[PDB]
Structure formats: C-alpha cells, structure tokens
Amino acid sequence: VNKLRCDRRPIFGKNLIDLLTKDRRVKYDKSSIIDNELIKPLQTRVLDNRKIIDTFAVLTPSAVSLDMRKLALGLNDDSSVGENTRLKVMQNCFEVS
C-alpha cells in the first residue's frame, strides 16, 4: 500500500483545467443584442424550410442492407465492445433528439 500511494499520488496534469476555463471565459458581460433573431441558426433554418424540404424530397435509395447500420458503429449481439456499451448508446440515442 505504501508503494501504491507513492506511485499513484504523483499524477499531475499537463497545464490545468483552471487555465483553459479562464482563457475560455471572457470578461465581457451579456450585452444582449438583436443578433439572436438576426442569426436565425441552422437548426431553425431547417425547421422553417419544412415546406420545401417536404415538397422536394421524392427519391429513395432503392437498395439498402438491413442491420448494417448496427454494425456500422459496431453495436450488435456479438462484438468486441462492452456488453452494456451498446445498451447505453442505444438508450442515449433514444433520448438524443
């Protein structure tokens, strides 16, 4: 236990997490502007272009391989990844919208 403590304890990061979180942080306050409505983000653009995306989407991939989507990420009944890794990714994908 003494040697375990002597070896495990000296674990030091490269620079920090405080350094990155303080350089990322900006001293500027909120200072809200109309830029929020001006930008109209990409997700909102997809949302508001519903009419055109539903009126101009006709084709289909006439051939597709079933269950190849599962093996694309490697999740299936038999794989080298963890047993409940596939369960967790399936669940969070269920919540991810």
Binding site: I33, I34, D35, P41, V96
Partner: protein
C-alpha cells in the same frame, strides 16, 4: 513601450484640406505623395464610391508600408482595416478565390446602435394587486403586480401586469436578491443576491452583487460593430450543445468551405432591412495588399471581376515592381507585374527616394523614438553611410550602437563606438563582395 521600425508615423501629417507640412506626423518629403494619400483618405471617408483601387510604385526603402500604416492610423480604429499579402492567398485548406472573397468581406463593417430602458435594484417588496374579473368566478383575480425596487440613492415601486408572474417563475427570485427589468419588453433577469447578506452564511457559493449604482430606472445606449464577414461566418457555422450536429462540429476537423452566394445575398438583404430601419449602418473598409506582384494571373482576373461589385470597398495595392514578367505567363511583361487591365481600372502613384537632409531627419527622429541621442559627428557620418550604403542599414544600426554605448557606460554614441558598430555588421553590398572574393562556398 515597444515598436518595430514603426510607430513614429503619426497619421498623414496634413492640414485642414490644404498642403501637408513638410515634417509632420513622422514624415519627411513626398509632400505630393502624402497629399494624394490624404485625398484617398478623404475619398474613403466619403463612403460613396465603390470598388475603387489604387497602387503606389517605387523602389526599395521607399516607405510604402509606412504610408499604408499612415492610412490605417488616419482612418481610426472605428474604420476597419484589413492588411493582406499575396502570399497567404495560396491556401492549402481552401481555394485562393474563397480566401480572397473572405478577406474582401472582412474590410467592410456594420455598426448597430441599440436603445433600451433598464429597471434594476434590490427587490424591497413583492405583492399582487387583486381585483374582480369581468366574468363571475369564485377564484381570485389579480390585475397588477407591485414591486418595490431599491438602488443606490434611489428607490422605486412599479406596477406590473400579472403576466410578470411567468417571468418571475422563469427567474426564481423572491426577496433580498437584485434583479434586472426593462421597460417595454418586460421580463426579469437575476444578477445575484444583495451584498449585505453575505454574513448570514459562513460558507456559500453565491457571490452577492452590491446595490446597483444610480437610480432604479436607467436608459443606457448599446453600440456594437461587426464585419460582414463575421456575420457570414456566424450565419454559416453551426452552433449547438446537445443535437447531433453539435458534436459533429466536434470530433472532426472544422474546415472553412466556400460560402454559398445565397447566404451572402440573404445577409445583405437583412443588413438592408436593419439599415433602412436605422438600427444598422454600413461603413466601407479597405483591403491593404502589399507585394501584389507575388499574386498569380488568376487573382488578377478575379480582382478585375470583383472590383465592379456594389458592396465593393476601396482596395489599396502596394508593390515595388515595374517592368517585370507577370507570374503565370512568362511572355506577358507588364508594369509592376500587374496586368494592364487592372492598372487602367485603378490609379497609380510614384514614390521617390529620400534626400540627405531627409535621411538626417529620419535618423534623428528614429533616435528620439528610441530615446537614445546622437551627437553631430556620429549623426553626420551615419547619414553619409546611409546615403552610400542603404536606408535600412543606417536605420537598423541604432540598437547595436545603443547597446555598445551602454557597454562603455556612455549614454550617447561617439565616433569610435559607431565605427565599431559598422565593423561588426556588414550590409548587402559588403556581403556580396565577400561572397565573390571567397572561394570556400561562403
């Protein structure tokens, strides 16, 4: 307090729409040149003409970049200024055309001014104003909400329509905590608890903001400036925190693609929508491209195409070339390496070298900027050697001269000190001569 062969220029050194002073703003000579420069600056300040180009030509040591920095200084920080070089146009990540387009859109800038009344301070009291609903109902009916707000040297009680309850639910503030209110749009914002409450708990993570300065109600101005290129990038780049596209932005290599022209026309349309309303205002910028000789014929053709645009600001070109072969076609030899098609579409200014008195003034002004002083003898000999060797060789010897004077503990320079300074370092001509006189591959 640091500089790099510059910062001695103080604008253009002009007068009130007259003739520039002979030695003004760290300038000597080229009175006609910098008067034309001031004319150019006035044209930029006019903000009317679109897609106008100009090139200044001369030899080495002519101070073209110093003049360009003079335009940049005279413009002021409010006016955007985007320096550029023909070397960075050749980009591995994306084509030279798109890099040119982005540097083009960087020069132009958009300014927006915003107005909003602010109610802020410590919430002294919260109470609804119950009333009688027009339709008979056993339930309660509140018609107003009275909030008591306390700021520095002033307190205020304001009635609020009971629609403010939804905002107060979105904020979760009850009492003893400073809030943020605006007049017309309503809503609430929470900044933090009152600073006097910190002593209540020995240990807590909440920083307690002080009582806001000034009265409870305020009306401040918001000024913001953004280049159209930044708005293009913001409208183009995705943003998110949870959606799949959010970390598709991550776990990859974010590369700048060629922005579609429909995005540019749409953002121009919204800029028009916000400038006619008066919220936005457009001020043209300038793109400073020096050593344009290094650019290829493709860049010249695209500049010819793009100079006619109506969001095209003034562009200034700098090059020391003359009758030289154009990059891309060895047969085509054009003045300053630029094909004559652009030259006809732009204006041209000739630059001349500096005289012995002007070099003396340059040396003395540089010494004063360096905060190191030169006596008459060393100044004269340094001027003579600068006239015979080159401008830069005399210009850059001040630091070794100063450090050598410091080694001998003398504040100023003397004849043997500057003689040693010449001895240690050799200029281009001496280097070439020792090159031909050396057979050891040196």
């Amino acid at each position: 307090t640091r500089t790099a062969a510059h910062t001695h220029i103080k604008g253009l050194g002009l007068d009130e729409s007259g003739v520039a002073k002979r030695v003004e703003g760290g300038f000597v000579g080229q009175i006609e040149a910098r008067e034309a420069c001031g004319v150019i600056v006035d044209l930029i300040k006019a903000k009317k003409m679109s897609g106008r180009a100009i090139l200044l030509a001369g030899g080495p040591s002519t101070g073209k970049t110093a003049l360009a920095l003079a335009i940049s200084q005279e413009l002021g920080p409010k006016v955007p200024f985007c320096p550029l070089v023909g070397s960075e146009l050749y980009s591995v990540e994306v084509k030279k055309t798109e890099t040119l387009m982005e540097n083009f859109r960087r020069a132009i800038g958009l300014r927006i001014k915003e107005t909003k009344e602010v109610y802020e301070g410590e919430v002294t009291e919260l109470t609804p104003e119950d009333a009688e609903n027009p339709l008979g109902g056993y339930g309660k009916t509140i018609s107003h909400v009275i909030v008591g707000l306390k700021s520095a040297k002033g307190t205020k009680t304001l009635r609020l329509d009971p629609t403010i309850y939804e905002s107060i639910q979105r904020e979760k503030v009850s009492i003893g905590d400073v809030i943020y209110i605006e007049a017309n749009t309503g809503a609430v914002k929470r900044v933090g608890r009152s600073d006097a409450y910190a002593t209540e708990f020995d240990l807590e993570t909440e920083e307690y903001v002080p009582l806001p300065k000034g009265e409870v109600h305020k009306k401040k101005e918001i000024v913001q400036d953004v280049t159209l290129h930044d708005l293009d990038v913001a409208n183009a780049r995705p943003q998110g925190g949870q959606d799949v596209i959010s970390m598709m932005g991550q776990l990859l290599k974010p590369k700048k693609t060629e922005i579609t022209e429909k995005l540019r026309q749409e953002v121009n349309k919204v800029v028009a929508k916000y400038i006619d309303q008066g919220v936005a205002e457009l001020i043209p910028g300038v793109l400073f491209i020096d050593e344009v000789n290094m650019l290829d014929i493709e860049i010249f053709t695209y500049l010819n195409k793009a100079l006619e645009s109506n969001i095209a600001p003034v562009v200034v070109l700098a090059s020391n070339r003359g009758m030289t072969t154009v990059r891309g076609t060895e047969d085509v030899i054009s003045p300053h390496g630029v094909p004559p098609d652009l030259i006809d579409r732009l204006l041209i200014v000739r630059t001349l070298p500096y005289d012995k008195d002007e070099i003396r003034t340059i040396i003395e002004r540089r010494a004063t900027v360096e905060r190191l002083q030169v006596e008459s003898s060393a100044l004269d000999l340094l001027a003579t050697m600068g006239t015979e060797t080159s401008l830069r060789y005399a210009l850059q010897l001040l630091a070794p001269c100063g450090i050598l004077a410091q080694t001998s503990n003398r504040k100023e320079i003397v004849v043997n000190d500057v003689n040693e300074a010449k001895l240690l370092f050799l200029d281009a001509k001496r280097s070439t001569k020792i090159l031909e006189t050396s057979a050891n591959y040196l």
